[PDB]
Write a protein that binds this ligand. Structure first.
Ligand SMILES: CCc1cc(/C(C)=N/OCc2ccc(C3CCCCC3)c(C(F)(F)F)c2)ccc1CN1CC(C(=O)O)C1
Ligand SMILES: *[C@@H]1O[C@H](CO)[C@@H](O)[C@H](O)[C@H]1NC(C)=O
Lengths: 331, 51, 290, 222
């Protein structure tokens, strides 16, 4: 029965690909070369940088380093607004609440720590610690000041209630380590990519997997939602990125090149969704054209692998964080 | 039984031909092309990271 | 005076040296070889991003010193012979002081490398800090002291006022200046030897206290120290002895003092040996080369 | 009116970051690894005199942080690189696991599983210049067992006599042969027991040896 179910899924999918994305997008003008330069350089981390996340104001950002520091920067002036001494230095992810009041991080401690930034004293206290995951913490993203979603190496994702500190919902069904997650703009769905080489779309309200997407031949390390919420992009260890559309339940475009054989560490879109920025293990970040399968730029300024990558909500700047301990704002 | 149950719920789903999805993506990208700084280099006066 | 062409004639006549060669060809070839080796070393410390730690600046400083010494020896071979008498005493002093400055710089760079190494093995710190204050202090003292020591003869302190005190080797130098230079060389040699002996002693004594089950780094270290010190002394001992003898022997007494080019070419040869010694034993430079 | 205060606060933060980094650079980092039923807990218990456990101990004017990651059932290739840069790896094997089968209980000899793990870790691309301290545990229990059940049950190709010294050295050699990076890193070995009182000393000497070697490599002398 399972074999026939898979065959039916395959046939109902192949009956939808009347024409490849490249055909319909064939004639639109190419973006041409994209050239961005390093307008800032943030210094102060003394180890590898593993994650960064822009604030919603597009000015402040948080970076997590294995030096055991969570640093909140003002990217305009480069002033360090805050420096938080994490209890566990083996951090892998960090998030900035949409309201600018809280930050989150976590990692090999299997805990999601939540820190309050706006306090009467004026110092940053630890506000909450979320402890129900059995593997390490790969990614975390607030929904508001009281709800956060986490993905774990234990092959599960969770929706938490920060006030009570309890897992409100659990998302099971992945077979490998879940490595990244991206909330939908509306905040009602979210996609997760795992080491089983598949992505899954989850309904936050209900707690069930709505769709599964396959095609990658290795781990999915990064996943980003397209701006309009009807598509997403996955970057993998097979040196490929791919673009999936929820309503088609099928792979549309695949961004790869022979000269590229390393892994992908992070993916993001530009504010219009026209550019797909992908960090790589070979110390670079490629600027793909999402609609047309053609590379259109390189952000080459780091000495070690580009571990993290982000775009501001206003779309003005890009942020690259690297194992070489430096962050760069690109424009 | 759990695996077949999940797949069976993923089969009876309203799909669309990929051409429609490609058209939607292309249209959305075209509609917001005039507001993407990284795509259309903004004047230096209005860019907060230059002056 | 300093613009009289008769002074050089007068001094060379007093020291018995009043007169292109074949040996110049082979010597210039050796100089080209040394220049090429040191250019390769300099190009390697620049291309590889890993080589930006303080210790690598000291190696490149030595490479620059040896390159300068090769260039100076080339120029001194080109401008010597019959071009000496077509030379002003100011030009003569420049020609000789160039060699003095370059070789002094190379020896001081060797001492600088020894001091860095002895500081690093004395700290025994898990990460070695990319300190720049001593790296600037030491690499500048080298060149400054070299220029001052090798500039003294032109700014006075020479044999021009009185012909009695003239070395047979450089007839326009004052024997006391050569004595000063040989003493400085002796101090530098003793410093380098003692520094590397203390480095080896540290490594060996620290390794002795460790208790494993049934040396390896305390024997290869001894071999490297032996190579370094032995090559240095072997290349620089003939010329040092020659100049001591010159300060001793009176004019027109010692014939050996006339064929002093062989000693000089050996001392410059040390500059070619330096890149091999400080790149082959690294066992990380070799990989970066290819 | 506020930019001056902002710049002052940033400079203070830079000060504290520099001071914390300098303090952290003077600490030895040890990654603890081993199979399930090894004597890892014994090593940690005698060296102190849900996620990742850190143990800080100071010995002979030298501060060590040992990180135990035994409670990570997730795939190791996703987080092993996080430990690139540790001073050393402590790896624990149980000499008594040679006659024991795994939870499969069909043919998976425990000692073979430990050998596979050691081979994976030693030759891993992230640990090429990082040394391994090997602790062979349970030596008394092993000594007792090998009086009854011949070693041949593991390593069928072993003609040596059934005595503690011979077979113990044999297994030490079997583990040290799996090293392929035989030029870049060392493998220090030490036969632990239930109570020895000198395992901290052995780790100290191993880290000192590594420190001296790394210093010689910071000069051009190695
Ligand atoms: C006739 C051969 C000849 C010889 C020389 C000599 C003697 N250079 O000596 C360099 C030196 C440089 C540096 C030092 C040390 C000082 C202390 C610190 C460490 C370095 C010493 C020292 F002495 F100290 F060891 C010596 C120069 C030019 C010519 C060739 N000229 C052309 C020929 C002609 O025309 O006949 C004369
Ligand atoms: C060399 O010196 C002697 C004595 O000082 C002098 O008589 C002779 O003319 C000099 N030779 C030349 C070529 O000037």
């Amino acid at each position: 029965e399972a074999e026939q179910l898979k065959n039916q899924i395959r046939d109902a999918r192949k009956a939808c690909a009347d024409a490849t994305l490249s055909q319909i997008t064939n004639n639109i003008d190419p973006v041409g070369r994209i050239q961005m330069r390093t307008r800032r350089t943030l210094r102060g981390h003394l180890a590898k940088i593993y994650a960064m996340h822009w604030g919603t104001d597009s000015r402040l950002l948080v970076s997590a380093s294995q030096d055991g520091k969570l640093i909140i920067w003002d990217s305009y002036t480069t002033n360090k607004v805050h420096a938080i001494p994490l209890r566990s230095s083996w951090v892998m992810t960090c998030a900035y609440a949409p309201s600018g009041n809280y930050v989150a991080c976590g990692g090999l401690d299997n805990i999601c720590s939540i820190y309050n930034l706006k306090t009467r004293e004026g110092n940053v206290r630890v506000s909450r610690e979320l402890a129900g995951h059995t593997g390490y913490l790969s990614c975390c993203r607030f929904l508001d000041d009281n709800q956060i979603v986490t993905s774990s190496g234990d092959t599960t994702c969770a929706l938490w209630d920060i006030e009570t500190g309890q897992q409100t919902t659990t998302f099971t069904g992945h077979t490998g380590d879940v490595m990244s997650l991206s909330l939908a703009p509306d905040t009602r769905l979210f996609v997760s990519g795992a080491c089983d080489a598949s992505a899954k779309l989850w309904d936050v309200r209900e707690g069930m997997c709505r769709q599964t997407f396959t095609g990658h031949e290795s781990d999915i390390n990064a996943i980003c939602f397209f701006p309009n919420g009807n598509a997403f992009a996955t970057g993998s260890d097979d040196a490929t990125c791919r673009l999936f559309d929820l309503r088609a339940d099928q792979e549309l475009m695949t961004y790869s090149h022979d000269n590229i054989i390393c892994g992908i560490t992070s993916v993001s879109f530009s504010k219009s969704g026209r550019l797909l920025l992908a960090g790589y293990d070979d110390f670079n970040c490629n600027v793909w054209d999402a609609l047309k399968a053609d590379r259109a730029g390189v952000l080459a300024g780091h000495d070690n692998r580009v571990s993290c990558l982000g775009v501001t909500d206003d779309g003005m700047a890009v942020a690259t964080g690297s194992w070489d301990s430096f962050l760069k704002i690109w424009n | 039984r759990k695996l077949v149950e999940q797949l069976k719920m993923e089969a009876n789903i309203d799909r669309i031909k990929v051409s429609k999805a490609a058209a939607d993506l292309m249209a959305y990208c075209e509609a917001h092309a005039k507001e993407d700084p990284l795509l259309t280099p903004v004047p230096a006066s209005e860019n907060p990271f230059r002056e | 005076d300093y613009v009289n062409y008769d002074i050089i004639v007068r001094h060379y006549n007093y020291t018995g040296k009043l007169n292109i060669k074949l040996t110049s060809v082979v010597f210039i070839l050796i100089c080209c070889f040394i220049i090429l080796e040191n250019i390769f070393v300099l190009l390697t410390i620049w291309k590889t991003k890993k080589f930006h730690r303080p210790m690598y600046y000291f190696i490149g400083n030595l490479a620059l010193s040896d390159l300068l010494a090769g260039v100076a020896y080339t120029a001194n071979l080109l401008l010597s012979g019959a071009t000496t008498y077509k030379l002003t005493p100011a030009q003569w002093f420049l020609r000789e002081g160039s060699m003095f400055v370059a070789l002094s710089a190379s020896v001081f760079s060797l001492l600088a490398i020894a001091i860095e190494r002895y500081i690093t093995m004395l700290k025994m710190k898990l990460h070695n800090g990319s300190n720049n204050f001593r790296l600037f202090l030491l690499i500048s003292a080298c060149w400054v002291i070299s220029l001052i020591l090798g500039g003294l003869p032109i700014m006075g302190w020479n044999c021009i006022s009185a012909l009695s005190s003239c070395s047979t080797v450089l007839p326009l130098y004052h024997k006391h200046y050569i004595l000063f230079c040989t003493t400085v060389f002796t101090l530098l040699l003793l410093s380098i030897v003692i520094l590397y002996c203390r480095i080896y002693s540290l490594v060996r004594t620290r390794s002795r206290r460790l208790t494993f089950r049934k040396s390896e780094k305390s024997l290869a270290l001894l071999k490297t120290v032996i190579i370094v010190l032995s090559v240095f002394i072997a290349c620089w001992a003939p010329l040092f002895i020659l100049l001591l003898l010159d300060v001793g022997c009176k004019v027109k007494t010692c014939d050996i003092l006339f064929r002093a080019e062989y000693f000089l070419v050996l001392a410059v040869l040390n500059s070619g040996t330096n890149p091999i010694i400080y790149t082959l034993t690294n066992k990380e430079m070799r990989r970066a080369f290819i | 009116a506020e930019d001056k205060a902002a710049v002052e606060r940033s400079k203070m933060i830079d000060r504290n970051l520099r001071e914390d980094g300098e303090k952290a650079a003077r600490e030895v980092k040890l990654l603890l690894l081993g199979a399930g039923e090894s004597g890892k807990s014994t090593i940690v218990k005698q060296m102190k005199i849900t996620g990742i456990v850190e143990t800080h101990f100071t010995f002979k004017d030298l501060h060590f942080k040992m990180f135990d990651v035994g409670a990570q059932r997730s795939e190791r290739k996703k987080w092993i690189h996080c430990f690139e840069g540790v001073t050393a790896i402590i790896f624990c094997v149980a000499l008594s696991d040679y006659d024991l089968v795994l939870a499969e209980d069909e043919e998976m000899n425990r000692m073979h599983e430990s050998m596979k793990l050691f081979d994976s870790i030693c030759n891993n691309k992230w640990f090429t210049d990082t040394s391994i301290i090997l602790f062979l545990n349970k030596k008394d229990l092993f000594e007792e067992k090998i009086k009854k059940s011949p070693l041949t049950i593991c390593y069928p190709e072993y003609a040596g006599s059934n005595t503690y010294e011979e077979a113990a050295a044999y297994i030490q050699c079997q583990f040290e042969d799996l090293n392929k990076r035989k030029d870049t890193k060392e493998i220090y070995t030490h036969f632990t027991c239930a109570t020895d009182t000198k395992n901290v000393q052995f780790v100290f000497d191993a880290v000192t040896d590594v420190i001296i070697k790394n210093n010689l490599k910071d000069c051009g002398l190695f």
